[PDB]
Design a protein around this ligand. Structure first.
Ligand SMILES: NC(=O)c1ccc[n+]([C@@H]2O[C@H](COP(=O)([O-])OP(=O)(O)OC[C@H]3O[C@@H](n4cnc5c(N)ncnc54)[C@H](OP(=O)(O)O)[C@@H]3O)[C@@H](O)[C@H]2O)c1
Ligand SMILES: NC(=O)c1ccc[n+]([C@@H]2O[C@H](COP(=O)([O-])OP(=O)(O)OC[C@H]3O[C@@H](n4cnc5c(N)ncnc54)[C@H](OP(=O)(O)O)[C@@H]3O)[C@@H](O)[C@H]2O)c1
Ligand SMILES: NC(=O)c1ccc[n+]([C@@H]2O[C@H](COP(=O)([O-])OP(=O)(O)OC[C@H]3O[C@@H](n4cnc5c(N)ncnc54)[C@H](OP(=O)(O)O)[C@@H]3O)[C@@H](O)[C@H]2O)c1
Ligand SMILES: NC(=O)c1ccc[n+]([C@@H]2O[C@H](COP(=O)([O-])OP(=O)(O)OC[C@H]3O[C@@H](n4cnc5c(N)ncnc54)[C@H](OP(=O)(O)O)[C@@H]3O)[C@@H](O)[C@H]2O)c1
Ligand SMILES: O=C(O)c1cccc(C(=O)O)n1
Ligand SMILES: O=C(O)c1cccc(C(=O)O)n1
Ligand SMILES: O=C(O)c1cccc(C(=O)O)n1
Ligand SMILES: O=C(O)c1cccc(C(=O)O)n1
Ligand SMILES: [Cl-]
Ligand SMILES: [Cl-]
Ligand SMILES: [Cl-]
Ligand SMILES: [Cl-]
Ligand SMILES: [Cl-]
Ligand SMILES: [Cl-]
Ligand SMILES: [Cl-]
Ligand SMILES: [Cl-]
Ligand SMILES: [Cl-]
Ligand SMILES: [Cl-]
Ligand SMILES: [Cl-]
Ligand SMILES: [Cl-]
Lengths: 245, 245, 245, 245
């Protein structure tokens, strides 16, 4: 048994997670915190692990508190960068038995997409990422598309950059540059969370597309991380380290 | 019978057009000009109409010469803007029997896409355009995607802008802004010319996608324009005015 | 004000419609019938119009009762064919003030798709339809894909059939034949309701794709039909006749 | 140096291969055979290896001759089945130094697609394959889509079948059944060779799409196989065994 708190409990993903923890036989909901609730509600309820689906402007402060209080964390909130991960590692030095897992996508199709993008990258001259999300999303590009681009760029270390003869452009047409990989962010009513990774070489392309049509797609990955969180003290990035790929 | 010259005759599209004019029974090839050939080769050969698939940095000078010499023009080269079209109209005042048609896409699927985008626009909260071309293309976004965005924006005059809660972004992630419509330009080895128009509202999306897999797709539209060019003195923009839509 | 009953009130779409009628200020929910509820509950509650999202094996019997009792009907259930529509018209002769509207898709993107497919059809050598739905769906192909194929085939009356050199095949690989147009039905966990209409000619294709990611996408079209149902006595097929296209 | 013959030398792919062998510094074109040319032209020219892009009705007879004469073969022609591969293995028992490689796709994006489909299969409840080719293709479904389906089915040995509630259908709507995996074949003017592998589970899908826009995409894989053919005596199926995946 495990006492699980949710940060962002009234949000689109957090409300899904509250229902999932409540339904799980081996997990007990110990706290449901919304904006304006004090983090001390987590220690009042004897919370052992927290699920965080909040906002990029608040998640680092949530983590600072969770780590100082020895509460393990499964974080889906995005906005992460290498400097933020370094900061989380710095806080965890003081708390060597506390575990944090931060992943920009808990859906298995997105995890597989990032795995396949790493494997495909060296076979193609060009790579770009298009991500498409609902228009309530705070951050562009998405966490998943920034990680995918970073993985592709690492895989292509020492190979030529993408070819591109653009000489006349409007500002922003060619996307954001993430480690040399263009990333484009579409924000469209009707969508949930979607990504296409595009690879090209002479005469052919390969596209790896993931679509989450419902936030229920995030639940299995979050619950797996919650259940296994204390196995790996310190910081884990991504869900892939918990899987057999 | 008609004496047709090609500007850009060694280019990817221009070489296709040379073969098409040579094959056509009712057209005679009167000039094939490449970079560094003087435009006087067109008047030397008694050229009546020219097909131009060259480069955005040279097409206005080609038009200035064609119009001054009363040679009708079918222009596929992109880079056009309202100011350039105004300039072409200004030159045509002096030459009231000369005809110019400038279109950013001669493929029927792209013409139909722009027509359907205009019809769909008022039914959706969000609209964006993704275009994807080979990595030798000079201009981003494409002529076709800029015209599509302009048509959507005109169709949505007086309706609310696209919803977008982005508050933290990398530069360029949200595309170029064409009259309030995001346009994203992918440049990928393997591609020819492709575009997706995306519309969204509560719970649903509509995507109109055109793919030219071969530059032969441009030939029917160019030959139609060549054959009908002298029907409309002055400037025609797009191929749609020659069609029954 | 209008007294609206729902047939299929516990189903995936019907439960969405119950919530929508309950929320609407101008509509009153008069009956919510599930499998095994007698249709007399509709007359007991003084129902004026019914929304039907049930099953192909029961909808004709529901209509026979609704028409005999002068209750107008907005039907989304699929399984319809020309013979069934003829039967509905035959029953309506006896009840000249009763209105029935039967549509295989109430989402505006699907209505627009069918409208654009009709306009595009004569410009292309080939046309096919791919539809993709959740794996609880009873009927293949979908109502929407059969109507789209029928519209394309009517539009192409007198033009050559799709080209196809297939000489060796496994049974079923080339889809169902709807009036000469191949229709393919994908049934996949994760999906809701999706369709791609594909057109092809030399060197190019045009794809019109509609995606309903949530059954809320059907609500505006159903409520519009409910509100306008008594305007057109007799049978209306599709939602397009209520729109300005 | 290597003496290479092409069977199907005037075909769409074979003409591409003739040009590639002629351009390669380490290969010499020893024969170019078209329909109605006798296979003895291969032995007359001292051919060491042949590339075969012909037709399903003739390739087994070509192989019977090639193997009996000790000529190694790189075969792209489709129509293969397990019984045909068993027959090729039976002929190779008599000729233990002769090598044959038969692959249904030599484009790296298709090879990678089949590799990723095998890795993804066990994570999803549903899987189907859509393939889309030009309308001159003899066989449906394609060789690549049949192999992809077979790989997915092998990967899912012991897992539940795809869910499917279909109870009313038109014949062929649900595709061909390849080892329990639906395969749908679109034949459309404008296309070259394309495939989408679709996987689904609760709330999400993963699509792996490969597009060959030009038959030049097949050349690198064929030349690699030609260059390495004698390394593996006997039969090799697919190009994957020559790669590091
Ligand atoms: N890793 C993944 O698989 C994955 C999947 C989906 C989303 N995401 C990411 O998860 C995050 C949440 O997405 P969402 O769509 O669910 O957003 P959302 O609907 O806006 O939900 C976030 C919730 O957090 C609340 N909140 C804000 N500050 C808080 C605080 N200090 N303590 C507790 N709650 C707080 C918000 O309240 P207010 O609205 O009142 O401010 C809101 O209810 C985003 O960063 C998103 O990119 C990740
Ligand atoms: N409307 C449509 O349907 C459509 C379809 C395709 C492309 N396009 C547009 O058409 C244009 C050409 O595209 P492309 O892919 O064919 O480009 P490309 O392969 O670069 O061909 C352009 C050709 O024009 C030549 N050229 C440059 N300056 C010239 C001059 N002053 N006189 C004569 N020739 C000149 C170039 O020579 P160098 O290479 O030596 O400079 C080149 O051979 C681009 O603007 C493109 O966006 C339009
Ligand atoms: N036009 C459109 O826009 C549109 C949109 C979506 C769906 N559809 C179509 O709408 C239909 C329903 O789809 P769905 O996904 O909502 O199916 P569903 O979840 O199976 O719902 C149908 C409901 O009808 C109930 N039912 C069966 N017989 C009945 C009867 N005689 N009286 C009252 N209720 C009865 C079922 O009960 P049991 O489960 O107990 O039998 C079930 O709860 C299907 O034909 C579908 O193709 C149309
Ligand atoms: N593995 C891959 O990567 C790959 C890629 C593309 C295609 N394919 C497959 O390759 C095959 C060829 O495709 P394609 O599009 O190139 O077809 P195609 O254009 O019809 O070419 C086949 C050529 O083979 C000729 N031919 C027929 N019988 C022959 C014989 N006994 N000896 C020599 N030549 C003969 C044909 O002549 P006629 O037209 O006069 O009969 C034709 O010119 C098909 O099975 C296709 O599915 C495989
Ligand atoms: O990668 C991300 O940023 C991500 C992934 C899934 C959903 C969302 C979201 O809904 O914002 N964001
Ligand atoms: O809209 C355009 O800019 C366009 C259209 C088709 C082809 C090309 C090209 O190949 O550059 N560009
Ligand atoms: O055209 C149809 O058959 C259709 C349309 C939307 C949804 C559904 C469904 O969910 O079955 N079916
Ligand atoms: O898998 C196949 O059957 C295949 C693969 C690529 C091209 C072709 C073809 O053009 O027929 N066929
Ligand atoms: Cl970073
Ligand atoms: Cl600790
Ligand atoms: Cl991961
Ligand atoms: Cl402009
Ligand atoms: Cl004049
Ligand atoms: Cl136009
Ligand atoms: Cl019918
Ligand atoms: Cl009546
Ligand atoms: Cl309709
Ligand atoms: Cl087999
Ligand atoms: Cl031997
Ligand atoms: Cl392979």
């Amino acid at each position: 048994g495990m006492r699980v708190g949710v940060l962002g409990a009234k949000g689109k993903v957090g409300a899904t997670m509250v229902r999932a923890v409540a339904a799980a036989d081996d997990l007990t909901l110990s706290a449901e915190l919304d904006a304006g609730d004090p983090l001390s509600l987590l220690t009042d309820g004897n919370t052992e692990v927290v699920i965080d689906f909040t906002h990029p402007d608040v998640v680092m402060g949530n983590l600072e508190f969770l780590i100082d209080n020895g509460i393990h964390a499964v974080v889906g909130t995005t906005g992460f960068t290498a400097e933020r991960f370094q900061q989380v590692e710095s806080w965890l030095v003081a708390k060597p038995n506390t575990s944090v897992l931060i992943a920009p996508n808990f859906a298995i199709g997105a995890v597989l997409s990032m795995h396949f993008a790493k494997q495909a990258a060296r076979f193609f001259d060009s790579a770009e990422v298009i991500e498409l999300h609902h228009p309530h999303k705070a951050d562009a590009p998405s966490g998943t598309a920034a990680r995918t681009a970073k993985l592709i760029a690492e895989a292509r270390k020492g190979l030529p950059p993408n070819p591109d003869a653009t000489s006349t452009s409007l500002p922003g047409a060619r996307g954001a540059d993430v480690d040399g990989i263009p990333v484009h962010a579409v924000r469209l009513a009707g969508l949930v969370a979607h990504q296409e990774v595009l690879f090209g070489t002479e005469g052919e392309t390969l596209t790896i597309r993931h679509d989450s049509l419902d936030r229920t797609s995030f639940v299995p990955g979050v619950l797996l991380a919650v259940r296994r969180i204390a196995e790996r003290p310190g910081l884990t990035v991504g869900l892939e380290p918990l899987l057999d790929l």
